[PDB]
């Protein structure tokens, strides 16, 4: 553990919160009959709730005095105390997806501007071209460093200034 936080398995308030959230459904389940569809819906919600709590405990999460799980952000403490999947690993997952959107839109912009009437290509897209680039962007990091090391990424003082 770290930062004076208990694991969620050993916490009492964590189990208190489980017994509470299930008690609401059991009271709500008493109204309806056993074989009815409202009964099946609530039993599934009961099954999901029981699964949500045990999985968060199994994953070595850290619960505070309030009883709710807390996340850790420094990769040093995350890797040292086995909490990397929380924040440190979600960061790489998103950046790969965010870069993919940039490398794709940047290429559609450059290529349509090499032809006549690029304004029409923005409001009326070339879907065959857009899908081609969208399935060619799996290795977007390679092309970026290829384009940076080459020097064809940035423009050089051919841009408008104001003074």
């Amino acid at each position: 553990d770290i930062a004076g936080l208990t694991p969620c398995s050993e916490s009492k308030a964590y189990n208190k919160l489980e017994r509470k959230e299930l008690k609401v459904l059991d009271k709500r389940l008493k109204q309806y009959e056993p074989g009815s569809a409202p009964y099946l819906a609530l039993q599934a919600t009961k099954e999901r709730t029981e699964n949500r709590f045990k999985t968060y405990a199994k994953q070595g999460l850290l619960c505070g005095n309030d009883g709710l799980p807390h996340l850790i952000s420094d990769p040093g403490l995350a890797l040292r105390f086995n909490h990397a999947g929380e924040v440190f690993i979600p960061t790489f997952g998103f950046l790969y997806v965010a870069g993919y959107i940039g490398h794709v839109g940047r290429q559609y912009i450059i290529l349509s501007k090499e032809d006549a009437k690029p304004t029409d290509k923005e409001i009326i897209l070339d879907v065959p071209l857009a899908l081609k680039l969208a399935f060619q962007g799996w290795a977007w990091p390679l092309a970026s460093i290829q384009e940076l090391r080459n020097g064809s990424l940035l423009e050089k003082d051919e841009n408008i200034t104001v003074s």
Binding site: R48, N51, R52, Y56, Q59, L61, P69, G85, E86, I89, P90, G93, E122, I123, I124, L125, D126, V127
Partner: protein, 40 residues
């Protein structure tokens, strides 16, 4: 048909197909492997 495909290539329509894909993909990703928070 050439003009119909061109209408379908407008911005309002291509965006509609994008939205059904991204929203359909995420809702389907929550229906199976329900309510994710920590990534294993």
């Amino acid at each position: 048909m050439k003009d119909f495909t061109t209408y379908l290539s407008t911005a309002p329509v291509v965006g509609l197909g994008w939205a059904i894909f991204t929203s359909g993909l995420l809702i389907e990703i929550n229906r199976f492997f329900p309510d994710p928070l920590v990534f294993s």
